[PDB]
Design a protein around this ligand. Sequence first.
Ligand SMILES: *[C@](O)(C(N)=O)[C@H](CC1CCC1)NC(=O)[C@@H]1[C@@H]2[C@H](CN1C(=O)[C@@H](NC(=O)NC(C)(C)C)C(C)(C)C)C2(C)C
Ligand SMILES: [Zn+2]
Ligand SMILES: [Zn+2]
Lengths: 17, 22, 183, 152
Amino acid sequence: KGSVVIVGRIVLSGKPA
Amino acid sequence: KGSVVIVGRIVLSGKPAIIPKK
Amino acid sequence: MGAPITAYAQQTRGLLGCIITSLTGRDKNQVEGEVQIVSTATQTFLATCINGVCWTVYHGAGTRTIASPKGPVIQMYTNVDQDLVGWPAPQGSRSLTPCTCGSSDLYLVTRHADVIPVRRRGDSRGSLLSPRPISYLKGSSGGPLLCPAGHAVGLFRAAVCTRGVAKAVDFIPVENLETTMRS
Amino acid sequence: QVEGEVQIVSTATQTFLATCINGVCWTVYHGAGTRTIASPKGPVIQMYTNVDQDLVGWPAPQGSRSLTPCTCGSSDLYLVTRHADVIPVRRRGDSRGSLLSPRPISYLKGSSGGPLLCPAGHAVGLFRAAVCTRGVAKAVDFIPVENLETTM
Ligand SMILES: *[C@](O)(C(N)=O)[C@H](CC1CCC1)NC(=O)[C@@H]1[C@@H]2[C@H](CN1C(=O)[C@@H](NC(=O)NC(C)(C)C)C(C)(C)C)C2(C)C
Ligand SMILES: [Zn+2]
Ligand SMILES: [Zn+2]
Protein backbone atom coordinates (compact mmCIF):
# COMPACT_ATOMS: atom_id res chain seq x y z
CA LYS A 1 0.00 0.00 0.00
CA GLY A 2 1.57 3.23 -1.23
CA SER A 3 0.06 6.22 -3.04
CA VAL A 4 -1.93 6.51 -6.25
CA VAL A 5 -0.41 9.13 -8.51
CA ILE A 6 -2.16 10.94 -11.34
CA VAL A 7 0.02 10.63 -14.39
CA GLY A 8 -2.37 12.35 -16.75
CA ARG A 9 -5.85 13.66 -17.50
CA ILE A 10 -8.66 13.30 -20.01
CA VAL A 11 -11.09 16.10 -20.92
CA LEU A 12 -14.24 14.52 -22.32
CA SER A 13 -15.28 17.63 -24.29
CA GLY A 14 -11.94 17.84 -26.03
CA LYS A 15 -11.48 21.34 -24.66
CA PRO A 16 -8.10 22.76 -25.76
CA ALA A 17 -8.11 26.11 -23.89
CA LYS B 1 -29.76 49.36 -33.78
CA GLY B 2 -26.73 47.85 -32.02
CA SER B 3 -25.28 44.74 -33.66
CA VAL B 4 -25.59 41.35 -31.99
CA VAL B 5 -22.03 40.45 -30.93
CA ILE B 6 -20.34 37.06 -30.49
CA VAL B 7 -18.82 36.95 -26.99
CA GLY B 8 -17.99 33.25 -26.93
CA ARG B 9 -18.67 29.81 -28.38
CA ILE B 10 -19.78 26.32 -27.46
CA VAL B 11 -18.02 23.52 -29.32
CA LEU B 12 -19.82 20.24 -29.79
CA SER B 13 -17.25 18.74 -32.18
CA GLY B 14 -14.66 18.12 -29.46
CA LYS B 15 -13.86 14.52 -28.58
CA PRO B 16 -12.21 13.17 -25.39
CA ALA B 17 -8.51 13.93 -25.30
CA ILE B 18 -5.60 13.49 -22.92
CA ILE B 19 -4.94 17.04 -21.70
CA PRO B 20 -1.44 17.86 -23.00
CA LYS B 21 1.22 18.06 -20.32
CA LYS B 22 2.96 21.31 -21.30
CA MET C 1 -20.71 15.64 -34.64
CA GLY C 2 -21.49 12.32 -32.93
CA ALA C 3 -22.14 10.59 -29.58
CA PRO C 4 -21.71 10.92 -26.64
CA ILE C 5 -22.66 14.60 -26.83
CA THR C 6 -20.01 16.57 -25.00
CA ALA C 7 -19.51 20.31 -25.35
CA TYR C 8 -17.34 23.08 -23.99
CA ALA C 9 -17.58 26.86 -23.92
CA GLN C 10 -14.97 29.54 -24.54
CA GLN C 11 -15.54 33.23 -23.87
CA THR C 12 -13.96 35.42 -26.54
CA ARG C 13 -15.02 38.97 -25.66
CA GLY C 14 -15.56 41.03 -22.58
CA LEU C 15 -18.19 43.58 -21.74
CA LEU C 16 -16.25 46.57 -23.14
CA GLY C 17 -14.93 44.98 -26.33
CA CYS C 18 -18.45 43.71 -26.86
CA ILE C 19 -20.04 47.21 -26.62
CA ILE C 20 -17.48 48.69 -29.00
CA THR C 21 -18.01 45.83 -31.48
CA SER C 22 -21.79 46.22 -31.19
CA LEU C 23 -21.49 49.84 -32.28
CA THR C 24 -18.75 49.47 -34.87
CA GLY C 25 -20.39 46.28 -36.11
CA ARG C 26 -16.91 45.10 -37.07
CA ASP C 27 -15.67 41.98 -35.32
CA LYS C 28 -12.30 40.63 -36.33
CA ASN C 29 -12.24 37.70 -33.86
CA GLN C 30 -11.86 34.16 -35.18
CA VAL C 31 -14.96 31.98 -35.11
CA GLU C 32 -15.17 28.31 -34.18
CA GLY C 33 -17.99 26.05 -33.08
CA GLU C 34 -21.58 25.43 -34.07
CA VAL C 35 -23.22 27.43 -31.32
CA GLN C 36 -22.14 31.05 -30.74
CA ILE C 37 -22.70 32.78 -27.39
CA VAL C 38 -24.19 36.06 -28.51
CA SER C 39 -25.18 39.36 -26.94
CA THR C 40 -26.99 42.57 -27.55
CA ALA C 41 -26.84 45.50 -25.14
CA THR C 42 -30.02 44.22 -23.52
CA GLN C 43 -29.24 40.49 -23.32
CA THR C 44 -27.06 37.40 -23.89
CA PHE C 45 -28.26 34.20 -25.49
CA LEU C 46 -27.15 31.58 -28.02
CA ALA C 47 -27.26 31.24 -31.80
CA THR C 48 -26.95 27.88 -33.51
CA CYS C 49 -25.50 27.30 -36.97
CA ILE C 50 -27.64 24.81 -38.86
CA ASN C 51 -26.92 24.18 -42.54
CA GLY C 52 -24.82 27.29 -43.07
CA VAL C 53 -27.14 29.77 -41.42
CA CYS C 54 -26.70 31.09 -37.91
CA TRP C 55 -30.16 30.99 -36.32
CA THR C 56 -31.39 32.50 -33.07
CA VAL C 57 -34.56 33.66 -31.34
CA TYR C 58 -36.17 36.79 -32.75
CA HIS C 59 -37.12 37.77 -29.21
CA GLY C 60 -33.39 38.04 -28.62
CA ALA C 61 -31.86 39.35 -31.82
CA GLY C 62 -34.77 41.50 -32.97
CA THR C 63 -33.84 42.74 -36.41
CA ARG C 64 -30.30 43.55 -35.43
CA THR C 65 -27.35 42.93 -37.73
CA ILE C 66 -24.58 40.60 -36.63
CA ALA C 67 -21.11 42.11 -36.16
CA SER C 68 -18.74 40.46 -38.62
CA PRO C 69 -15.19 41.01 -39.95
CA LYS C 70 -16.74 42.93 -42.82
CA GLY C 71 -19.02 45.17 -40.80
CA PRO C 72 -22.63 44.41 -39.79
CA VAL C 73 -24.32 41.57 -41.57
CA ILE C 74 -28.04 41.89 -42.32
CA GLN C 75 -30.34 39.02 -41.47
CA MET C 76 -31.11 36.53 -44.20
CA TYR C 77 -34.31 35.41 -42.53
CA THR C 78 -36.57 37.08 -40.00
CA ASN C 79 -39.85 35.66 -38.81
CA VAL C 80 -41.50 37.35 -35.92
CA ASP C 81 -44.09 34.58 -35.71
CA GLN C 82 -41.77 31.58 -35.84
CA ASP C 83 -39.70 33.73 -33.45
CA LEU C 84 -36.61 33.18 -35.62
CA VAL C 85 -33.87 35.21 -37.32
CA GLY C 86 -30.85 33.92 -39.18
CA TRP C 87 -27.68 35.42 -40.62
CA PRO C 88 -25.22 33.69 -42.91
CA ALA C 89 -23.26 31.49 -40.50
CA PRO C 90 -20.04 33.27 -39.63
CA GLN C 91 -16.82 32.23 -41.31
CA GLY C 92 -15.13 29.61 -39.19
CA SER C 93 -18.25 28.25 -37.52
CA ARG C 94 -19.30 24.62 -38.05
CA SER C 95 -22.93 23.81 -38.83
CA LEU C 96 -25.24 21.14 -37.48
CA THR C 97 -27.71 19.15 -39.62
CA PRO C 98 -31.46 18.76 -39.04
CA CYS C 99 -32.46 15.55 -37.28
CA THR C 100 -33.41 13.04 -39.93
CA CYS C 101 -34.74 10.34 -37.54
CA GLY C 102 -37.50 11.80 -35.35
CA SER C 103 -35.91 10.77 -32.03
CA SER C 104 -38.11 11.19 -28.95
CA ASP C 105 -35.14 11.75 -26.65
CA LEU C 106 -33.54 15.17 -27.09
CA TYR C 107 -30.49 16.79 -25.53
CA LEU C 108 -30.42 20.53 -24.79
CA VAL C 109 -27.00 22.23 -24.89
CA THR C 110 -26.95 25.13 -22.44
CA ARG C 111 -24.99 28.40 -22.50
CA HIS C 112 -22.74 26.88 -19.87
CA ALA C 113 -22.09 24.01 -22.28
CA ASP C 114 -24.12 21.46 -20.36
CA VAL C 115 -26.01 18.84 -22.28
CA ILE C 116 -29.21 18.13 -20.39
CA PRO C 117 -31.76 15.50 -21.48
CA VAL C 118 -35.32 16.48 -22.34
CA ARG C 119 -38.15 14.11 -23.34
CA ARG C 120 -40.13 15.27 -26.35
CA ARG C 121 -43.81 15.77 -25.50
CA GLY C 122 -44.87 17.26 -28.83
CA ASP C 123 -43.63 19.19 -31.85
CA SER C 124 -42.28 21.96 -29.63
CA ARG C 125 -42.09 20.67 -26.05
CA GLY C 126 -39.96 18.36 -24.00
CA SER C 127 -39.94 17.50 -20.32
CA LEU C 128 -36.68 18.35 -18.61
CA LEU C 129 -35.78 14.90 -17.26
CA SER C 130 -33.98 16.72 -14.45
CA PRO C 131 -35.72 19.99 -13.50
CA ARG C 132 -33.30 22.90 -13.23
CA PRO C 133 -33.78 26.39 -11.82
CA ILE C 134 -34.83 28.96 -14.41
CA SER C 135 -31.62 30.89 -13.68
CA TYR C 136 -29.62 27.97 -15.02
CA LEU C 137 -31.51 27.93 -18.33
CA LYS C 138 -31.17 31.69 -18.72
CA GLY C 139 -28.95 32.72 -21.58
CA SER C 140 -29.61 29.51 -23.48
CA SER C 141 -32.33 30.86 -25.82
CA GLY C 142 -31.37 29.95 -29.36
CA GLY C 143 -29.37 26.93 -28.21
CA PRO C 144 -29.77 23.60 -29.98
CA LEU C 145 -31.84 20.57 -28.94
CA LEU C 146 -29.90 17.65 -30.33
CA CYS C 147 -31.04 14.09 -31.01
CA PRO C 148 -28.69 11.28 -29.84
CA ALA C 149 -26.85 11.56 -33.16
CA GLY C 150 -25.83 15.19 -32.71
CA HIS C 151 -28.39 16.65 -35.08
CA ALA C 152 -30.57 19.68 -34.62
CA VAL C 153 -34.16 18.98 -33.62
CA GLY C 154 -34.94 22.50 -32.41
CA LEU C 155 -33.69 25.70 -30.78
CA PHE C 156 -34.42 26.40 -27.08
CA ARG C 157 -37.01 29.15 -26.93
CA ALA C 158 -38.71 29.43 -23.54
CA ALA C 159 -38.90 27.59 -20.24
CA VAL C 160 -42.02 25.96 -18.83
CA CYS C 161 -41.56 26.85 -15.16
CA THR C 162 -43.32 27.22 -11.82
CA ARG C 163 -41.92 28.61 -8.56
CA GLY C 164 -38.77 29.45 -10.49
CA VAL C 165 -38.01 25.85 -11.48
CA ALA C 166 -38.41 24.69 -15.06
CA LYS C 167 -39.71 21.22 -15.68
CA ALA C 168 -40.12 21.56 -19.42
CA VAL C 169 -38.85 23.69 -22.29
CA ASP C 170 -40.64 25.19 -25.28
CA PHE C 171 -38.58 25.07 -28.46
CA ILE C 172 -38.64 25.99 -32.16
CA PRO C 173 -38.41 22.70 -34.14
CA VAL C 174 -36.07 22.76 -37.15
CA GLU C 175 -39.21 22.47 -39.27
CA ASN C 176 -39.89 26.18 -38.73
CA LEU C 177 -36.39 26.96 -39.94
CA GLU C 178 -37.16 25.56 -43.38
CA THR C 179 -40.61 27.18 -43.51
CA THR C 180 -38.96 30.45 -42.45
CA MET C 181 -36.54 30.12 -45.36
CA ARG C 182 -39.35 29.36 -47.79
CA SER C 183 -41.18 32.49 -46.57
CA GLN D 1 -6.38 25.76 -18.16
CA VAL D 2 -8.72 22.94 -19.14
CA GLU D 3 -9.98 20.58 -16.44
CA GLY D 4 -10.25 16.83 -16.80
CA GLU D 5 -13.07 14.63 -15.54
CA VAL D 6 -11.03 11.46 -15.97
CA GLN D 7 -7.60 11.17 -14.37
CA ILE D 8 -5.15 8.58 -15.65
CA VAL D 9 -3.82 7.21 -12.37
CA SER D 10 -1.25 4.56 -11.52
CA THR D 11 0.27 2.58 -8.66
CA ALA D 12 3.64 0.80 -8.74
CA THR D 13 2.27 -2.44 -10.15
CA GLN D 14 -0.37 -0.99 -12.47
CA THR D 15 -2.12 1.93 -14.12
CA PHE D 16 -5.83 2.52 -14.53
CA LEU D 17 -8.37 5.34 -14.51
CA ALA D 18 -10.34 7.42 -12.02
CA THR D 19 -13.48 9.46 -12.70
CA CYS D 20 -14.68 12.52 -10.84
CA ILE D 21 -18.42 12.32 -10.27
CA ASN D 22 -20.08 14.58 -7.74
CA GLY D 23 -16.92 16.04 -6.21
CA VAL D 24 -15.47 12.58 -5.57
CA CYS D 25 -12.69 10.96 -7.59
CA TRP D 26 -13.77 7.33 -8.09
CA THR D 27 -11.83 4.28 -9.21
CA VAL D 28 -11.72 0.49 -8.78
CA TYR D 29 -10.66 -1.13 -5.49
CA HIS D 30 -8.71 -3.75 -7.42
CA GLY D 31 -6.57 -0.93 -8.76
CA ALA D 32 -6.10 1.38 -5.77
CA GLY D 33 -7.06 -0.77 -2.81
CA THR D 34 -6.95 1.35 0.31
CA ARG D 35 -4.11 3.32 -1.20
CA THR D 36 -4.10 6.99 -0.49
CA ILE D 37 -3.98 9.52 -3.37
CA ALA D 38 -1.07 11.88 -3.96
CA SER D 39 -1.54 15.65 -3.48
CA PRO D 40 1.00 18.50 -3.64
CA LYS D 41 0.24 18.86 0.09
CA GLY D 42 0.84 15.17 0.78
CA PRO D 43 -1.17 11.91 0.67
CA VAL D 44 -4.93 12.36 0.93
CA ILE D 45 -7.03 9.39 2.02
CA GLN D 46 -10.11 7.78 0.53
CA MET D 47 -13.42 9.30 1.56
CA TYR D 48 -14.96 6.03 0.48
CA THR D 49 -13.77 2.42 0.18
CA ASN D 50 -16.09 -0.44 -0.69
CA VAL D 51 -14.39 -3.70 -1.48
CA ASP D 52 -17.77 -5.31 -2.09
CA GLN D 53 -18.93 -3.05 -4.92
CA ASP D 54 -15.23 -2.75 -5.97
CA LEU D 55 -15.52 1.01 -5.32
CA VAL D 56 -13.14 3.50 -3.67
CA GLY D 57 -13.09 7.29 -3.81
CA TRP D 58 -11.01 10.24 -2.62
CA PRO D 59 -11.92 13.92 -2.87
CA ALA D 60 -11.53 15.11 -6.47
CA PRO D 61 -7.93 16.24 -7.17
CA GLN D 62 -6.84 19.48 -8.80
CA GLY D 63 -7.24 20.04 -12.52
CA SER D 64 -10.38 17.93 -12.36
CA ARG D 65 -14.05 18.66 -13.02
CA SER D 66 -16.95 16.46 -12.01
CA LEU D 67 -19.11 14.37 -14.30
CA THR D 68 -22.87 14.53 -14.02
CA PRO D 69 -24.73 11.30 -13.27
CA CYS D 70 -27.02 9.99 -16.02
CA THR D 71 -30.69 10.94 -15.68
CA CYS D 72 -32.16 9.56 -18.91
CA GLY D 73 -31.73 5.83 -18.35
CA SER D 74 -30.41 5.41 -21.88
CA SER D 75 -28.90 2.06 -22.76
CA ASP D 76 -26.62 3.41 -25.46
CA LEU D 77 -23.46 3.75 -23.38
CA TYR D 78 -19.96 4.88 -24.40
CA LEU D 79 -16.79 3.71 -22.69
CA VAL D 80 -13.75 6.01 -22.59
CA THR D 81 -10.37 4.27 -22.50
CA ARG D 82 -7.12 5.48 -20.93
CA HIS D 83 -6.21 6.50 -24.48
CA ALA D 84 -9.34 8.63 -24.75
CA ASP D 85 -10.88 6.16 -27.19
CA VAL D 86 -14.68 5.97 -27.07
CA ILE D 87 -16.21 2.51 -27.33
CA PRO D 88 -19.96 2.22 -28.05
CA VAL D 89 -21.65 -0.15 -25.59
CA ARG D 90 -25.23 -1.37 -25.23
CA ARG D 91 -26.39 -1.80 -21.68
CA ARG D 92 -27.29 -5.42 -21.19
CA GLY D 93 -28.15 -5.00 -17.52
CA ASP D 94 -27.64 -3.10 -14.27
CA SER D 95 -23.87 -3.56 -14.44
CA ARG D 96 -23.36 -5.24 -17.78
CA GLY D 97 -22.90 -3.90 -21.27
CA SER D 98 -22.09 -5.43 -24.64
CA LEU D 99 -19.49 -3.75 -26.86
CA LEU D 100 -21.07 -2.88 -30.20
CA SER D 101 -17.81 -4.11 -31.71
CA PRO D 102 -15.56 -6.36 -29.58
CA ARG D 103 -11.95 -5.31 -29.25
CA PRO D 104 -8.82 -7.17 -28.23
CA ILE D 105 -8.56 -7.17 -24.44
CA SER D 106 -5.38 -5.10 -24.80
CA TYR D 107 -7.47 -2.24 -26.21
CA LEU D 108 -9.40 -1.87 -22.95
CA LYS D 109 -6.34 -2.50 -20.75
CA GLY D 110 -5.77 0.19 -18.14
CA SER D 111 -9.20 1.77 -18.59
CA SER D 112 -10.73 0.29 -15.45
CA GLY D 113 -12.16 3.07 -13.29
CA GLY D 114 -13.02 5.02 -16.42
CA PRO D 115 -16.52 6.31 -17.22
CA LEU D 116 -19.41 4.74 -19.11
CA LEU D 117 -21.22 7.74 -20.56
CA CYS D 118 -24.81 8.01 -21.81
CA PRO D 119 -25.71 9.85 -25.09
CA ALA D 120 -25.48 13.15 -23.14
CA GLY D 121 -21.96 12.46 -21.84
CA HIS D 122 -23.25 11.79 -18.33
CA ALA D 123 -21.86 9.12 -16.03
CA VAL D 124 -23.84 5.90 -16.27
CA GLY D 125 -21.27 3.78 -14.52
CA LEU D 126 -17.61 3.25 -13.83
CA PHE D 127 -15.78 0.62 -15.87
CA ARG D 128 -15.21 -2.29 -13.50
CA ALA D 129 -13.79 -5.14 -15.62
CA ALA D 130 -13.77 -6.49 -19.18
CA VAL D 131 -15.67 -9.73 -19.85
CA CYS D 132 -13.83 -11.47 -22.68
CA THR D 133 -14.00 -14.74 -24.56
CA ARG D 134 -10.50 -15.87 -25.50
CA GLY D 135 -8.48 -12.74 -26.30
CA VAL D 136 -11.38 -10.50 -27.29
CA ALA D 137 -13.36 -8.25 -24.95
CA LYS D 138 -17.02 -8.64 -25.96
CA ALA D 139 -18.62 -7.06 -22.92
CA VAL D 140 -17.82 -5.03 -19.79
CA ASP D 141 -18.83 -4.98 -16.14
CA PHE D 142 -19.42 -1.60 -14.51
CA ILE D 143 -20.32 0.09 -11.21
CA PRO D 144 -23.61 1.99 -11.69
CA VAL D 145 -23.59 5.64 -10.55
CA GLU D 146 -26.33 4.77 -8.09
CA ASN D 147 -23.84 2.66 -6.10
CA LEU D 148 -21.62 5.72 -5.99
CA GLU D 149 -24.53 8.06 -5.17
CA THR D 150 -25.48 5.49 -2.53
CA THR D 151 -21.97 5.41 -1.11
CA MET D 152 -22.21 9.21 -0.68
C1 LIG E 1 -33.96 33.22 -23.69
O1 LIG E 1 -34.45 34.28 -24.57
C2 LIG E 1 -32.66 33.72 -23.05
N1 LIG E 1 -32.49 35.01 -22.76
O2 LIG E 1 -31.81 32.86 -22.81
C3 LIG E 1 -34.98 32.97 -22.53
C4 LIG E 1 -34.57 31.74 -21.72
C5 LIG E 1 -35.37 31.51 -20.42
C6 LIG E 1 -35.06 30.18 -19.70
C7 LIG E 1 -35.03 30.96 -18.36
C8 LIG E 1 -34.88 32.26 -19.16
N2 LIG E 1 -36.33 32.79 -23.04
C9 LIG E 1 -37.33 33.61 -22.71
O3 LIG E 1 -37.20 34.55 -21.92
C10 LIG E 1 -38.69 33.30 -23.30
C11 LIG E 1 -39.10 34.27 -24.33
C12 LIG E 1 -40.06 35.12 -23.55
C13 LIG E 1 -40.67 34.39 -22.41
N3 LIG E 1 -39.67 33.33 -22.22
C14 LIG E 1 -39.63 32.40 -21.26
O4 LIG E 1 -38.85 31.46 -21.29
C15 LIG E 1 -40.68 32.49 -20.16
N4 LIG E 1 -41.47 31.27 -20.18
C16 LIG E 1 -42.48 31.12 -21.02
O5 LIG E 1 -42.98 32.07 -21.64
N5 LIG E 1 -42.95 29.87 -21.11
C17 LIG E 1 -43.99 29.41 -22.04
C18 LIG E 1 -43.83 29.90 -23.50
C19 LIG E 1 -45.32 29.93 -21.53
C20 LIG E 1 -44.00 27.85 -22.07
C21 LIG E 1 -39.91 32.68 -18.85
C22 LIG E 1 -40.95 33.09 -17.82
C23 LIG E 1 -39.17 31.42 -18.32
C24 LIG E 1 -38.91 33.84 -19.04
C25 LIG E 1 -40.48 34.48 -24.86
C26 LIG E 1 -40.64 35.40 -25.98
C27 LIG E 1 -41.37 33.26 -24.89
ZN1 LIG F 1 -31.49 12.36 -35.41
ZN1 LIG G 1 -28.13 10.30 -19.62
